[PDB]
From a paper:
The regulatory cluster consists of three genes, aioX, aioS and aioR, which encode a periplasmic-binding protein (PBP), a sensor histidine kinase and a response regulator, respectively. Arsenite-bound AioX is thought to act as a ligand for AioS, the sensor histidine kinase that upon auto-phosphorylation, phosphorylates AioR, the response regulator, which binds to a conserved sequence upstream of a RpoN promoter. AioX exhibits a typical bilobed structure of the PBP type II class. In this class of proteins, the ligand-binding pocket is located in the space between the two domains.
While the majority of both structures overlay very well, there is a significant difference in the rotamer conformation of Tyr88. The change in the side chain conformation is further associated with the backbone shift for residues 83–88 and a significant conformational change in the loop region comprising residues 53–61, demarked by the black circle in Fig. 5A. It should be noted that while surface residues 59–61 in the arsenite-bound structure are near the neighbouring molecule in the asymmetric unit, they are too distant to be directly involved in the interactions, while in the apo-AioX Asp61 interacts with the side chain of Arg281 from the crystallographic symmetry related molecule. These small differences in molecular packing support the idea that 53–61 loop conformation change might result in the generation of a new protein interaction surface. The fact that the arsenite-bound and apo-AioX crystals displayed differences in molecular packing (forming weak local and crystallographic symmetry related dimers, respectively) supports the idea that loop conformation change might result in the generation of a new protein interaction surface.
Author numbering: 41 to 304
Write the structure that this text describes.
């Protein structure tokens, strides 16, 4: 009950997938500082589990996490805002293979070495795990080996370089990189696209509905197109902005989590 507050407002995220990442991070840190009206520090961690645990335990004010970890810690978290990409707050998981790989569909990946992105990513893990669960298999049964690359861009590199025969990646990442690193991406192709799911949201700890810091962060995200600097960050990410959503937008993820739970 003695309150504990941080020395600065902290916004957590996982590493940005772009090549000029320090530039995007600097502009985003500047934007949020400018919009919130006091210093904001960006805290990057490698994995979704680390970002999420920091947020749940009160060591961040907000964080950009995946819908999967959000749904896992749903009672301890509140949604702040969801990104818009190509006009909509949704995205797909892609199952990718080498550009010239001679195969017809998903079942031909049996026996592959498979690159997943993060065990707490919807698009880098859970969707593919759902395909497998529905057919009575798990990654250890279906693939000869699988591994986590801890980044979507890294899945693409692992498949492009031939260390993995197939991989599971965020379809937003793959499409954005198709334009920013076209020579890299041209070494892969999309074998399977999933259904649409809610785009990875920004969330806050549930004890913080009343927090002035959370409210200002929320307005900063929602108003990000109103400022030159905010537009600049959005342009580099190819996002359109942020919108308000509710947990219902993440129901297709929760439904897949339940399908996977019911695998033996």
């Amino acid at each position: 009950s003695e309150p504990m507050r941080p020395g600065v407002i902290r916004f957590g995220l996982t590493p940005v997938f772009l090549s000029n990442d320090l530039e995007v991070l600097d502009e985003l840190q500047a934007y949020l500082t400018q919009a919130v009206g006091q210093e904001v520090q960006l805290i990057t961690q490698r994995t979704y589990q680390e970002v999420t645990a920091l947020l749940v335990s009160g060591n961040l004010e907000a964080a950009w996490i995946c819908g999967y970890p959000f749904m896992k810690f749903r009672d301890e978290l509140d949604l702040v805002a969801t990104p818009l990409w190509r006009g909509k707050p949704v995205y797909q998981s892609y199952l990718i293979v080498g550009r010239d790989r001679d195969i017809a569909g998903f079942e031909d990946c049996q026996g592959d070495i498979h690159a997943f992105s993060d065990p707490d990513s919807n698009s880098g893990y859970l969707v593919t795990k759902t395909y497998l669960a529905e057919r009575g298999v798990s990654e250890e049964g279906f693939f000869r080996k699988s591994f986590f690359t801890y980044g979507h861009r890294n899945v693409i590199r692992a498949v492009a370089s031939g260390l993995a025969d197939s991989g599971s990646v965020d379809g937003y990442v793959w499409e954005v990189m198709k334009t920013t690193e076209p020579e890299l991406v041209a070494k892969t192709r999309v074998l399977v696209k999933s259904g649409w799911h809610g785009f990875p949201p920004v969330a806050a700890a549930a004890g913080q509905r009343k927090s002035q810091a959370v409210a200002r962060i929320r307005s900063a995200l929602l108003d990000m197109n109103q400022e030159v600097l905010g537009r600049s960050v959005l342009t580099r990410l190819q996002l359109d902005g942020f919108v308000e959503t509710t947990a219902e937008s993440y129901d297709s993820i929760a439904a897949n989590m339940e399908r996977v739970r019911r695998l033996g």
